[PDB]
Amino acid sequence: MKGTCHCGAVEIEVELLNGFADARRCDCSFCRRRGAIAATARLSDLRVVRGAENLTLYQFGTRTAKHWFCRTCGIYTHHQRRSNPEEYGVNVAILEGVNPRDLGEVPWT
């Protein structure tokens, strides 16, 4: 499944752990500001195809979670959850063929 930021500078290759069945929405001070809907993915299921040099890393608080976003279009691609260092949180909207609207209402973690 292909993932790409808007600028198109960044492209990932990720396999979702359990599809979109569990797409939630963290409402913490940071996630509430991101606004994206995420889905899990094992560390060994995500691969940065291109644009690794165009991504920005953001850490805070425990500096456990790793958040990445395209420096050009500012689009949040994925992040390394702070609850599970063996998982990634992916922006469903960057996934090819996925219109977030079609997911309908989604909870808030």
Place of tokens 């949040």: 76
Q: How many residues does the chain have?
A: 109
The domain 1-109: what is its CATH number? Answer: 2.170.150.70
C-alpha distances in Å from residue 89, one per residue of 21, 81: 14, 6
47, β-bridge pairs: 13
Name the pairing type of β-strands 2-4 and 11-14.
antiparallel
CA distances from 64 to 18, 26, 94 (A): 23, 16, 24
- Beta-bridge mates of residue 38: 24, 91
Experimental method: X-ray
Q: Return the half-sphere exposure (C-beta side, CA atoms, 13 A cut-off) of residue 74.
A: 3
Q: Which amino acid is at 11?
A: E
Q: Which residues contact 45 (CB under 8 A, 6 or more apart)?
A: 14, 15, 16, 17, 88
**Rounded to a whole number, what is the distance in angstroms from the first to the last CA of the chain?**
24
Q: Which amino acid is at 98?
A: V
Torsion angle defined by CA atoms of residues 22, 27, 28 and 29, in that order, rounded to the nearest 10 degrees: 140
C-alpha pair distances (Å), 83 with each of 40, 79, 88: 12, 12, 10
Question: Would strands 11-14 and 46-50 be described as parallel, antiparallel, or unpaired?
Answer: antiparallel
Q: What count of other Cβ atoms lies within 10 Å of the Cβ of residue 105? A: 4
